[PDB]
Amino acid sequence: GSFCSPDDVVTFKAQEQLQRASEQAHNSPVLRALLAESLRLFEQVAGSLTPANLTTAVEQMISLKYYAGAIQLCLTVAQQKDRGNTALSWVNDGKPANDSRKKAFDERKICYNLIHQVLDKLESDFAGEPELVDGRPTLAATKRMEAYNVVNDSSDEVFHFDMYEWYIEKGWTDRILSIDSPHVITYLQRLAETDFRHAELLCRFYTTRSRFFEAAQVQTNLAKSDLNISLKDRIILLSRAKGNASVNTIGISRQQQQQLNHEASELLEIAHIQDDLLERLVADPRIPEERKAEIEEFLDGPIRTLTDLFNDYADQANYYDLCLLIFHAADFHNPRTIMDTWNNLINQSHFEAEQRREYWEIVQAGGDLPAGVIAEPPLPYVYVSQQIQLIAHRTSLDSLIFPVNSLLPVVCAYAINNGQDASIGADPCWPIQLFLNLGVPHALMVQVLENVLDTQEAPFTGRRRKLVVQWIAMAVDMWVREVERRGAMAAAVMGSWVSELLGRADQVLTQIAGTGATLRGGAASDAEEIASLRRTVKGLKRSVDMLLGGEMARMSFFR
Ligand code: NA
């Protein structure tokens, strides 16, 4: 009638043109003409094309290596089924359900999916094909450029959003990070606090633009959020934020940087504690499986308070080393509880070391271990001091969990009351060696050891003060060596109280030897052992007396 029912007729001729193209021997002029004309006709009836006809057309074009043309049709169809951009406003309004723009967005999404298939089949068809042959570009390369041209030449905004999402999906950080546009940044800023993977992209854009503080802000908020993020992923986020806030970002005050770097440092300290707990609890043989699943639920997520970590987990499982790390992170002012925790950690470790040495002695004698016991483990005082070192390096000795005035006497007490001395082949001064190497200043050691010797608290009583004197001798000796070394150092404090202390020490030894000579059952065997200590103490009082007397102010002078 009204010639020639144009929309429904053109769509048929276009299918006829495309069918003849695929029936060809691929002689370029005829194949290009049929393809080019088929695309010409389909575009004229873009707004009317049904999803079934569009799919079959694209697939036929894909089969004939007409990638750019297929993409161009899909974009044209998308723009024609929605010339008012009802889809762009429906996305810009949060995609409210119950709305009738969903239809307009879906008709575009069918076109965008088909564009994914074109590009997918493109990289597949040319998998292994070189981009250059003999110097100039191949045919397979020019079709890749021609296709991706059509993509970057578009002004469809819902399309470019759908392509950012698609690049993210496929993992092509290659091509997305390489976009100058802010349009992609702005698109990420709205969904950054919605998904981890999107936030990570946003932070990459910030960092490469030297906007480190803004990335540290995104990462920190993401770690404090209630999104489904694992604890370890929250450790990475905080660790990155801590680094990014520690460096200058232009336009932002030093105060604002430090306050964020400090919040990220504290939360990272708590997170590591929580991770150490969760790992240990899951691996613990003495924990029932039923409970472990419950622990994994409450600890492999957002970071918990230090109270909960202590009460509900660290204290229940007697992980006293992590209790001490918790008292450090919390600035916990309570000397008595701290020392109670130190006492439990020492005793727990001693019993565990004794148990492992027993199992060993059974292997070396032929016996059988208890069922389910994995078969020369360190002496108990060695494993104990390993525990003290691991904590000290993690807390740095500046903590309130290292009050040397209380902790050194306790460790010395353990050594006496458990025979961790010469009987088993240990250095009797091992407690002093430990705290010196850890970096306790020499003056503070002698100061404590003096208080141990004056107050005579058990076990430091009677003739066991012989051992206290030996510790003082060893500490002062190292102190003297340190002063002599520091004097030679500066060529290229000690008071009279140290001298008095060595005099009293000599008196204690004279008293112990006398008491030892009149003991019931026979004289003491340590006669010459004490005579040796007397000589050492006198030698140290001599050295200290020379330093105090002027030789310390003349250490940088040539002799
Ligand atoms: Na700054």
Coordinates of N, CA, C and O in Angstrom, one line a residue, residues 138-275:
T138 N 49.5 -6.4 10.3 CA 48.8 -7.4 9.6 C 47.4 -7.0 9.4 O 47.0 -5.9 9.7
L139 N 46.6 -7.9 8.8 CA 45.2 -7.7 8.7 C 44.5 -7.9 10.0 O 43.6 -7.2 10.4
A140 N 44.9 -9.0 10.7 CA 44.3 -9.3 12.0 C 44.5 -8.2 13.0 O 43.6 -8.0 13.9
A141 N 45.6 -7.4 12.9 CA 45.8 -6.3 13.8 C 44.9 -5.1 13.4 O 44.4 -4.4 14.3
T142 N 44.7 -4.8 12.1 CA 43.9 -3.7 11.7 C 42.4 -3.9 12.1 O 41.7 -2.9 12.4
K143 N 42.0 -5.1 12.1 CA 40.6 -5.4 12.5 C 40.5 -5.2 14.0 O 39.4 -4.8 14.5
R144 N 41.5 -5.4 14.8 CA 41.5 -5.1 16.2 C 41.5 -3.6 16.5 O 40.8 -3.2 17.4
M145 N 42.2 -2.9 15.7 CA 42.2 -1.4 15.9 C 40.9 -0.8 15.4 O 40.3 0.0 16.0
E146 N 40.4 -1.4 14.3 CA 39.1 -0.9 13.7 C 38.0 -1.1 14.6 O 37.1 -0.3 14.8
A147 N 38.0 -2.3 15.3 CA 36.9 -2.6 16.2 C 37.0 -1.7 17.5 O 36.0 -1.1 17.8
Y148 N 38.2 -1.7 18.1 CA 38.3 -0.9 19.3 C 38.2 0.6 19.0 O 37.9 1.3 20.0
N149 N 38.4 1.0 17.8 CA 38.1 2.4 17.5 C 36.6 2.7 17.7 O 36.2 3.6 18.4
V150 N 35.7 1.8 17.1 CA 34.3 2.0 17.2 C 33.9 2.1 18.7 O 33.0 2.9 19.0
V151 N 34.6 1.4 19.5 CA 34.3 1.4 21.0 C 34.6 2.8 21.6 O 33.8 3.4 22.2
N152 N 35.9 3.2 21.4 CA 36.3 4.5 22.0 C 35.7 5.7 21.3 O 35.9 6.8 21.8
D153 N 35.1 5.5 20.1 CA 34.5 6.6 19.4 C 33.0 6.8 19.8 O 32.3 7.6 19.1
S154 N 32.5 6.1 20.8 CA 31.1 6.2 21.2 C 30.9 7.3 22.2 O 31.8 7.7 22.9
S155 N 29.7 7.8 22.2 CA 29.2 8.8 23.2 C 28.1 8.2 24.1 O 27.5 9.0 24.9
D156 N 27.8 6.9 23.9 CA 26.8 6.3 24.8 C 27.4 6.1 26.2 O 28.4 5.5 26.4
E157 N 26.7 6.7 27.2 CA 27.3 6.8 28.5 C 27.0 5.5 29.3 O 27.9 4.9 30.0
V158 N 25.8 5.0 29.3 CA 25.4 3.7 29.8 C 26.3 2.6 29.2 O 26.7 1.7 29.9
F159 N 26.7 2.8 28.0 CA 27.6 1.9 27.3 C 29.0 1.9 28.0 O 29.5 0.8 28.3
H160 N 29.6 3.1 28.1 CA 30.9 3.2 28.7 C 30.9 2.7 30.2 O 31.9 2.2 30.6
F161 N 29.8 2.9 30.9 CA 29.7 2.3 32.2 C 29.7 0.8 32.1 O 30.4 0.1 32.9
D162 N 29.0 0.2 31.2 CA 28.9 -1.2 31.1 C 30.2 -1.8 30.6 O 30.5 -2.9 30.9
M163 N 31.1 -1.0 30.0 CA 32.4 -1.4 29.5 C 33.4 -1.3 30.6 O 34.3 -2.1 30.7
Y164 N 33.3 -0.3 31.5 CA 34.2 -0.2 32.7 C 33.9 -1.5 33.5 O 34.9 -2.1 34.0
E165 N 32.6 -1.8 33.8 CA 32.3 -3.0 34.5 C 32.8 -4.2 33.8 O 33.3 -5.2 34.5
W166 N 32.8 -4.3 32.5 CA 33.2 -5.4 31.8 C 34.7 -5.6 31.8 O 35.3 -6.7 32.0
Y167 N 35.5 -4.5 31.6 CA 36.9 -4.5 31.8 C 37.3 -5.0 33.2 O 38.2 -5.9 33.3
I168 N 36.6 -4.5 34.2 CA 36.9 -5.0 35.6 C 36.7 -6.5 35.7 O 37.5 -7.3 36.2
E169 N 35.6 -7.0 35.1 CA 35.2 -8.4 35.2 C 36.3 -9.3 34.5 O 36.9 -10.2 35.2
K170 N 36.7 -9.0 33.3 CA 37.7 -9.7 32.6 C 39.1 -9.6 33.2 O 40.0 -10.4 32.9
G171 N 39.3 -8.7 34.1 CA 40.6 -8.4 34.7 C 41.5 -7.5 34.0 O 42.7 -7.5 34.3
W172 N 41.1 -6.8 33.0 CA 41.9 -6.0 32.2 C 42.2 -4.6 32.9 O 41.8 -3.5 32.5
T173 N 43.0 -4.7 34.0 CA 43.6 -3.6 34.5 C 44.6 -2.9 33.5 O 44.8 -1.7 33.7
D174 N 45.0 -3.7 32.5 CA 45.8 -3.1 31.4 C 45.1 -1.9 30.8 O 45.6 -0.8 30.9
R175 N 43.9 -2.1 30.3 CA 43.3 -1.0 29.5 C 42.5 0.0 30.3 O 42.3 1.1 29.9
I176 N 42.0 -0.4 31.5 CA 41.2 0.5 32.3 C 42.1 1.6 33.0 O 41.7 2.8 33.0
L177 N 43.2 1.1 33.6 CA 44.1 2.1 34.3 C 44.7 3.0 33.3 O 45.2 4.1 33.7
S178 N 44.6 2.7 32.0 CA 45.3 3.5 31.0 C 44.3 4.6 30.3 O 44.6 5.0 29.2
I179 N 43.2 4.9 31.0 CA 42.3 5.9 30.5 C 42.5 7.2 31.2 O 42.5 7.3 32.4
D180 N 42.8 8.3 30.4 CA 43.1 9.6 30.9 C 41.8 10.1 31.6 O 41.9 10.9 32.6
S181 N 40.6 9.7 31.2 CA 39.4 10.4 31.5 C 39.2 10.4 33.0 O 39.5 9.5 33.8
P182 N 38.5 11.5 33.5 CA 38.0 11.5 34.9 C 36.6 10.7 35.0 O 36.2 10.3 36.1
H183 N 35.9 10.6 33.9 CA 34.6 9.9 33.8 C 34.7 8.6 34.5 O 33.7 8.1 35.1
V184 N 35.8 7.8 34.3 CA 36.0 6.6 35.0 C 36.3 6.7 36.5 O 35.8 6.0 37.3
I185 N 37.0 7.8 36.8 CA 37.2 8.1 38.3 C 35.9 8.4 38.9 O 35.6 7.8 40.0
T186 N 35.1 9.3 38.4 CA 33.9 9.7 38.9 C 32.9 8.5 39.1 O 32.2 8.3 40.0
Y187 N 33.0 7.6 38.1 CA 32.2 6.4 38.1 C 32.6 5.5 39.3 O 31.8 4.8 39.9
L188 N 33.9 5.5 39.6 CA 34.4 4.7 40.7 C 34.1 5.3 42.0 O 33.8 4.6 43.0
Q189 N 34.1 6.6 42.1 CA 33.9 7.3 43.4 C 32.5 7.0 44.0 O 32.3 7.1 45.2
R190 N 31.5 6.7 43.1 CA 30.2 6.4 43.6 C 30.1 5.0 44.1 O 29.3 4.7 45.1
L191 N 30.8 4.0 43.5 CA 30.8 2.6 43.9 C 32.0 2.2 44.6 O 32.2 1.0 44.9
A192 N 32.9 3.1 45.0 CA 34.1 2.7 45.7 C 33.8 2.0 47.0 O 34.3 0.9 47.3
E193 N 33.0 2.7 47.8 CA 32.6 2.2 49.1 C 31.5 1.2 49.0 O 30.7 1.0 50.0
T194 N 31.3 0.5 47.9 CA 30.4 -0.5 47.7 C 31.0 -1.9 47.5 O 30.4 -2.9 47.9
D195 N 32.2 -1.9 46.9 CA 32.9 -3.2 46.6 C 34.4 -3.0 46.7 O 34.9 -2.0 46.4
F196 N 35.1 -4.1 47.3 CA 36.5 -4.0 47.5 C 37.2 -3.8 46.1 O 38.1 -3.0 46.0
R197 N 36.9 -4.6 45.1 CA 37.6 -4.6 43.8 C 37.5 -3.3 43.2 O 38.4 -2.8 42.6
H198 N 36.3 -2.6 43.3 CA 36.2 -1.2 42.8 C 37.0 -0.2 43.6 O 37.7 0.6 43.0
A199 N 37.0 -0.3 44.9 CA 37.8 0.5 45.7 C 39.3 0.4 45.4 O 40.0 1.4 45.3
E200 N 39.8 -0.8 45.1 CA 41.2 -1.0 44.8 C 41.5 -0.3 43.5 O 42.6 0.4 43.4
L201 N 40.7 -0.3 42.5 CA 40.9 0.4 41.3 C 41.0 1.9 41.6 O 41.9 2.6 41.1
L202 N 40.0 2.5 42.3 CA 40.0 3.9 42.7 C 41.3 4.3 43.3 O 41.9 5.3 43.0
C203 N 41.8 3.4 44.3 CA 43.0 3.8 45.0 C 44.2 3.8 44.0 O 45.1 4.6 44.2
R204 N 44.2 2.9 43.0 CA 45.3 2.9 42.0 C 45.4 4.2 41.3 O 46.4 4.8 41.1
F205 N 44.2 4.7 40.9 CA 44.2 6.0 40.2 C 44.7 7.1 41.1 O 45.4 8.0 40.6
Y206 N 44.3 7.1 42.4 CA 44.8 8.2 43.3 C 46.3 8.1 43.4 O 47.0 9.1 43.2
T207 N 46.9 6.9 43.7 CA 48.3 6.8 43.9 C 49.2 7.2 42.7 O 50.1 8.0 42.9
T208 N 48.8 6.8 41.5 CA 49.6 7.2 40.3 C 49.5 8.7 40.1 O 50.3 9.2 39.4
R209 N 48.5 9.3 40.7 CA 48.4 10.8 40.7 C 49.0 11.4 41.9 O 48.6 12.6 42.2
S210 N 49.8 10.7 42.7 CA 50.4 11.2 43.9 C 49.4 11.7 45.0 O 49.7 12.5 45.8
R211 N 48.2 11.3 44.9 CA 47.1 11.6 45.9 C 47.1 10.5 46.9 O 46.1 9.8 47.1
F212 N 48.2 10.3 47.7 CA 48.3 9.2 48.6 C 47.3 9.3 49.7 O 46.8 8.2 50.2
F213 N 47.1 10.5 50.2 CA 46.2 10.6 51.4 C 44.8 10.2 51.1 O 44.1 9.6 51.9
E214 N 44.3 10.5 49.9 CA 42.9 10.1 49.5 C 42.8 8.6 49.4 O 41.7 8.1 49.8
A215 N 43.8 7.9 48.9 CA 43.8 6.5 48.9 C 43.8 5.9 50.3 O 43.1 4.9 50.6
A216 N 44.6 6.5 51.2 CA 44.6 6.0 52.6 C 43.3 6.2 53.3 O 42.9 5.4 54.1
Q217 N 42.5 7.2 52.8 CA 41.2 7.4 53.4 C 40.2 6.3 52.9 O 39.5 5.8 53.7
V218 N 40.3 6.0 51.6 CA 39.4 5.0 51.1 C 39.7 3.6 51.7 O 38.8 2.9 52.1
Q219 N 41.0 3.3 51.8 CA 41.4 2.0 52.3 C 41.0 1.8 53.8 O 40.6 0.8 54.2
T220 N 41.2 2.9 54.6 CA 40.9 2.8 56.0 C 39.4 2.6 56.3 O 39.0 1.7 57.0
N221 N 38.6 3.5 55.6 CA 37.1 3.3 55.8 C 36.6 2.0 55.3 O 35.7 1.4 55.9
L222 N 37.3 1.4 54.3 CA 36.9 0.1 53.8 C 37.3 -1.0 54.8 O 36.5 -2.0 55.0
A223 N 38.3 -0.8 55.6 CA 38.7 -1.7 56.6 C 37.8 -1.7 57.8 O 37.6 -2.7 58.5
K224 N 37.3 -0.5 58.1 CA 36.4 -0.3 59.3 C 34.9 -0.7 58.9 O 34.1 -0.6 59.8
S225 N 34.6 -1.0 57.7 CA 33.3 -1.1 57.2 C 32.7 -2.5 57.5 O 33.4 -3.3 58.0
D226 N 31.4 -2.6 57.2 CA 30.7 -3.9 57.4 C 30.5 -4.6 56.1 O 29.7 -5.6 56.1
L227 N 31.2 -4.3 55.1 CA 31.2 -5.1 53.9 C 31.8 -6.4 54.2 O 32.6 -6.6 55.1
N228 N 31.5 -7.4 53.3 CA 32.1 -8.7 53.5 C 33.5 -8.7 53.0 O 33.8 -8.9 51.8
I229 N 34.4 -8.5 54.0 CA 35.8 -8.4 53.7 C 36.5 -9.3 54.7 O 36.2 -9.2 55.9
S230 N 37.5 -10.1 54.3 CA 38.2 -11.0 55.2 C 39.1 -10.2 56.0 O 39.6 -9.1 55.7
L231 N 39.5 -10.8 57.2 CA 40.5 -10.1 58.1 C 41.8 -9.9 57.4 O 42.3 -8.8 57.5
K232 N 42.3 -10.8 56.6 CA 43.6 -10.7 56.0 C 43.5 -9.6 54.9 O 44.4 -8.8 54.7
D233 N 42.4 -9.5 54.2 CA 42.2 -8.4 53.2 C 42.1 -7.1 54.0 O 42.6 -6.0 53.4
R234 N 41.6 -7.0 55.2 CA 41.6 -5.8 56.0 C 43.0 -5.5 56.6 O 43.2 -4.3 56.9
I235 N 43.8 -6.5 56.7 CA 45.2 -6.2 57.1 C 46.0 -5.6 55.9 O 46.8 -4.7 56.1
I236 N 45.7 -6.0 54.7 CA 46.3 -5.4 53.5 C 45.9 -3.9 53.3 O 46.7 -3.0 53.1
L237 N 44.6 -3.7 53.5 CA 44.0 -2.4 53.3 C 44.7 -1.4 54.3 O 45.1 -0.3 54.0
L238 N 44.7 -1.8 55.6 CA 45.3 -0.9 56.6 C 46.8 -0.7 56.4 O 47.3 0.4 56.5
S239 N 47.5 -1.8 56.0 CA 48.9 -1.7 55.7 C 49.2 -0.7 54.6 O 50.2 0.1 54.6
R240 N 48.4 -0.7 53.6 CA 48.5 0.2 52.5 C 48.2 1.6 52.9 O 49.0 2.6 52.6
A241 N 47.1 1.8 53.7 CA 46.7 3.1 54.2 C 47.8 3.7 55.1 O 48.1 4.9 55.0
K242 N 48.5 2.8 55.9 CA 49.5 3.3 56.8 C 50.7 3.8 55.9 O 51.2 4.9 56.3
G243 N 51.1 3.2 54.9 CA 52.2 3.7 54.0 C 51.8 4.9 53.3 O 52.5 5.9 53.3
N244 N 50.6 5.0 52.8 CA 50.1 6.1 51.9 C 50.0 7.4 52.8 O 50.2 8.5 52.3
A245 N 49.6 7.3 54.1 CA 49.4 8.4 54.9 C 50.8 8.9 55.5 O 50.8 10.0 56.1
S246 N 51.8 8.1 55.4 CA 53.1 8.4 56.0 C 53.9 9.3 55.0 O 55.0 9.8 55.4
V247 N 53.5 9.5 53.8 CA 54.2 10.3 52.8 C 53.4 11.6 52.5 O 52.2 11.6 52.7
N248 N 54.1 12.6 52.1 CA 53.5 13.9 51.8 C 52.5 13.8 50.7 O 52.7 13.1 49.7
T249 N 51.3 14.4 50.9 CA 50.3 14.6 49.8 C 50.0 16.1 49.7 O 49.7 16.7 50.8
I250 N 50.2 16.7 48.6 CA 50.1 18.1 48.4 C 48.7 18.7 48.7 O 47.7 18.1 48.2
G251 N 48.6 19.8 49.4 CA 47.4 20.4 49.8 C 46.7 19.9 51.1 O 45.6 20.3 51.4
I252 N 47.4 19.0 51.8 CA 46.9 18.4 53.0 C 47.9 18.6 54.1 O 49.1 18.4 54.0
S253 N 47.4 19.0 55.3 CA 48.2 19.4 56.4 C 48.9 18.1 57.0 O 48.4 17.0 57.1
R254 N 50.1 18.4 57.5 CA 50.9 17.3 58.2 C 50.1 16.7 59.3 O 50.1 15.5 59.6
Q255 N 49.3 17.5 60.0 CA 48.4 17.0 61.1 C 47.4 16.0 60.6 O 47.2 15.0 61.3
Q256 N 46.8 16.3 59.5 CA 45.8 15.4 59.0 C 46.4 14.1 58.5 O 45.8 13.0 58.6
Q257 N 47.6 14.2 57.9 CA 48.3 12.9 57.5 C 48.6 12.1 58.7 O 48.2 10.9 58.7
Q258 N 49.2 12.7 59.7 CA 49.6 11.9 60.9 C 48.4 11.2 61.6 O 48.5 10.1 62.0
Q259 N 47.3 12.0 61.7 CA 46.2 11.4 62.4 C 45.6 10.2 61.7 O 45.1 9.2 62.4
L260 N 45.7 10.2 60.4 CA 45.3 9.0 59.6 C 46.3 7.9 59.7 O 45.9 6.7 59.9
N261 N 47.6 8.2 59.5 CA 48.6 7.2 59.7 C 48.6 6.6 61.1 O 49.0 5.4 61.2
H262 N 48.2 7.3 62.1 CA 48.1 6.8 63.4 C 46.9 5.9 63.6 O 47.0 4.8 64.3
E263 N 45.8 6.3 63.0 CA 44.6 5.4 63.1 C 44.8 4.1 62.4 O 44.4 3.0 62.9
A264 N 45.5 4.1 61.2 CA 45.8 2.9 60.5 C 46.8 2.1 61.2 O 46.8 0.8 61.1
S265 N 47.8 2.7 61.9 CA 48.8 1.9 62.6 C 48.2 1.2 63.8 O 48.5 0.0 64.0
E266 N 47.3 1.8 64.5 CA 46.7 1.1 65.7 C 45.8 0.0 65.2 O 45.8 -1.1 65.7
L267 N 44.9 0.3 64.2 CA 44.0 -0.8 63.7 C 44.8 -1.9 63.1 O 44.3 -3.1 63.1
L268 N 46.0 -1.6 62.5 CA 46.8 -2.7 61.9 C 47.4 -3.6 63.1 O 47.6 -4.8 62.9
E269 N 47.8 -2.9 64.2 CA 48.3 -3.7 65.3 C 47.2 -4.6 65.9 O 47.5 -5.8 66.2
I270 N 46.0 -4.1 66.0 CA 44.9 -4.9 66.5 C 44.6 -6.1 65.5 O 44.3 -7.2 65.9
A271 N 44.6 -5.8 64.2 CA 44.3 -6.8 63.2 C 45.3 -7.9 63.3 O 44.9 -9.1 63.1
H272 N 46.6 -7.6 63.4 CA 47.6 -8.7 63.4 C 47.4 -9.6 64.6 O 47.5 -10.8 64.5
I273 N 47.0 -9.0 65.8 CA 46.7 -9.8 67.0 C 45.6 -10.7 66.7 O 45.6 -11.9 67.0
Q274 N 44.5 -10.2 66.1 CA 43.3 -11.0 65.8 C 43.7 -12.1 64.8 O 43.2 -13.2 64.9
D275 N 44.6 -11.8 63.8 CA 45.0 -12.8 62.9 C 45.8 -13.9 63.5 O 45.6 -15.1 63.3

